[PDB]
Amino acid sequence: LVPRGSHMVGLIWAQATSGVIGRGGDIPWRLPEDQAHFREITMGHTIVMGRRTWDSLPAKVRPLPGRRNVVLSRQADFMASGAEVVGSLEEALTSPETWVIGGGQVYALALPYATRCEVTEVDIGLPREAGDALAPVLDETWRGETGEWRFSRSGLRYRLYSYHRS
Numbered sequence: 159l160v161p162r163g164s165h166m167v168g169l170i171w172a173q174a175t176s177g178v179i180g181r182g183g184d185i186p187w188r189l190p191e192d193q194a195h196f197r198e199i200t201m202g203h204t205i206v207m208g209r210r211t212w213d214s215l216p217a218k219v220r221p222l223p224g225r226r227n228v229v230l231s232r233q234a235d236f237m238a239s240g241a242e243v244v245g246s247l248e249e250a251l252t253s254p255e256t257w258v259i260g261g262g263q264v265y266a267l268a269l270p271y272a273t274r275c276e277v278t279e280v281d282i283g284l285p286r287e288a289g290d291a292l293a294p295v296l297d298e299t300w301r302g303e304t305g306e307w308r309f310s311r312s313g314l315r316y317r318l319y320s321y322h323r324s
């Protein structure tokens with residue numbers, strides 16, 4: 159349960175088996191089951207994203223519906239129509255339950271405050287290239303549940319992980 163006086167922080171991402179989450183301003187695969195899962199978990203909560211993740215959303219789609227959208231930027235003139243731009247996690251994490259939805263920089267930034275990670279891993283062979291955005295590495299304080307490999311309508315294997323810590 160999430161008490162309303164708390165500030166729970168979760169991270170949610172989809173990665174290739176290499177840990178790649180982003181390349182060239184996009185995600186280098188498509189998996190409908192991951193889109194459905196991401197929406198099931200985040201719906202109704204505040205979502206926090208880095209400015210480059212906001213940029214990666216088509217203008218017509220953003221802000222993402224059904225969730226309070228918060229974007230992190232250090233640029234005083236960056237504006238996100240329909241959403242709030244703040245300069246720090248201190249300002250972004252005021253809700254009782256917040257999902258950090260990427261990208262690579264913001265996962266690393268939020269990791270010290272997070273107590274849950276929800277991961278989709280896609281069995282697509284995409285080795286890491288310079289400039290890629292990557293999933294955060296999780297130390298031994300994080301305890302994980304790994305699901306069995308499942309198979310997408312799109313013909314890719316995928317599996318879910320849930321990590322927690324105190």
Ligand SMILES: NC(=O)c1ccc[n+]([C@@H]2O[C@H](COP(=O)([O-])OP(=O)(O)OC[C@H]3O[C@@H](n4cnc5c(N)ncnc54)[C@H](OP(=O)(O)O)[C@@H]3O)[C@@H](O)[C@H]2O)c1
Pocket residue numbers: 170171172173178179180181182183184185207208209210211212214230231232233236244245246247259260261262263264265267291292
């Ligand atoms: N597979 C997934 O689950 C997933 C999820 C989300 C995104 N992605 C992909 O990941 C990539 C984007 O990730 P990324 O690592 O390049 O960028 P990002 O984390 O989305 O955004 C980085 C931006 O966030 C701001 N930022 C970073 N640290 C900050 C801090 N301490 N305080 C205030 N603002 C801060 C900065 O904006 P300013 O430069 O404006 O100051 C920085 O440029 C894209 O390819 C995207 O498609 C994948």
Ligand SMILES: CCc1nc(N)nc(N)c1OCCCOc1cc(C)ccc1N1CC(C(=O)O)C1
Pocket residue numbers: 170171172185192193195196197211222223258259260277278
């Ligand atoms: C779904 C990708 C994803 N997957 C997981 N597991 N974690 C994340 N943080 C995550 O990136 C969330 C931000 C990027 O978003 C999208 C990206 C693409 C290529 C297709 C659909 C969406 N979606 C936002 C729209 C919505 O949510 O309404 C549908």
